[PDB]
Amino acid sequence: GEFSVCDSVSVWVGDKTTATDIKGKEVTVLAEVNINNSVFRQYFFETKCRASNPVESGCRGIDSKHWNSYCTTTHTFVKALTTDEKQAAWRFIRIDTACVCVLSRKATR
């Protein structure tokens, strides 16, 4: 019946230690949050691609003779507790969220 142009996988991540801030620098994630002892733990919902070429032409269903295609992982920004050297605060970190298909024109005639 129906199926995706690029395959994906969704998992919850609780073992995330390092991440990339919105400003572009590295930051270290903090497992437990809110009060002196684990009122709630930080879990992130991520979605990555399974392969760049699910079908060796790239994405499924593309007109291989006309287009060059590849599947790439798209990111999103989520607020999360982290630390830089010693200052710890709520920062927007880059989280994987989808698998989209990209296109270019095929020069082959």
Binding site: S10, V11, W12, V13, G14
Partner: protein, 202 residues
């Protein structure tokens, strides 16, 4: 490598999984009930239409289709047998699975399927703790916990093969998945063996 897995294409609502029990029968959940069905076996592989829909009489139909999810819902007796209009061909990819014989051990390593899955069969109170639905003695409870990466999969009607043998059938659960550590509730298969074996023979 899970040959018994079938996909129940319900027409204009969410898909359901199921288990192949006999060259002629398929076992899914009652909350998967609909007027039109299409059973996809394998993997257009094989696909047959369903002639005989049979929900366990002791299930609540009012619980069916788009209720605002309240935690006092007794999904108990969530079970259904679908009969194929034509038998399923056995291939190295389509194979049945036998009903349970022995009782489930708590602590067992179980498998589950699927916008694999290595579980452990926990006590029912662990499920009763997430006030999501009513958990009774006609149900099982399973969760997973070996790290910090839990996969988001919830296959309504799919199997729960514990210690190598069939034991349950995925009941109602949040979709695509639940809160990150939360257990899911499956329907216990032994408690209902008599009903199956008779409806499979009679």
């Amino acid at each position: 490598s899970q040959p018994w897995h079938v996909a129940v294409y319900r027409f204009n609502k969410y898909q359901c999984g199921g288990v192949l029990l006999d060259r002629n029968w398929v076992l899914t959940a009652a909350h998967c009930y609909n007027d039109k069905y299409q059973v996809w076996l394998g993997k257009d592989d094989q696909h047959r239409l369903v002639s005989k829909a049979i929900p366990h009489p002791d299930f609540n139909m009012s619980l069916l289709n788009e209720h605002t999810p309240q935690p006092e819902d007794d999904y108990s007796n969530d079970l259904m047998l679908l009969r194929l209009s034509k038998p399923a061909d056995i291939t190295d990819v389509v194979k049945p699975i036998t009903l349970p014989t022995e009782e489930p051990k708590l602590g067992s390593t179980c498998l589950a399927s699927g916008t694999c899955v290595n579980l452990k069969l926990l006590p029912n109170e662990d499920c009763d703790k997430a006030h999501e639905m009513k958990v009774t003695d006609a149900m099982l409870c399973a969760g997973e916990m070996d790290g910090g990466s839990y996969t988001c999969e919830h296959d309504s009607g799919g199997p729960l093969i514990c210690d190598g043998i069939l034991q349950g059938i995925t009941s109602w659960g949040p979709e695509p998945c639940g809160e990150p550590t939360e257990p899911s509730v499956y329907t216990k298969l032994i408690k209902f063996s008599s009903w199956i074996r008779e409806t499979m023979a009679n």
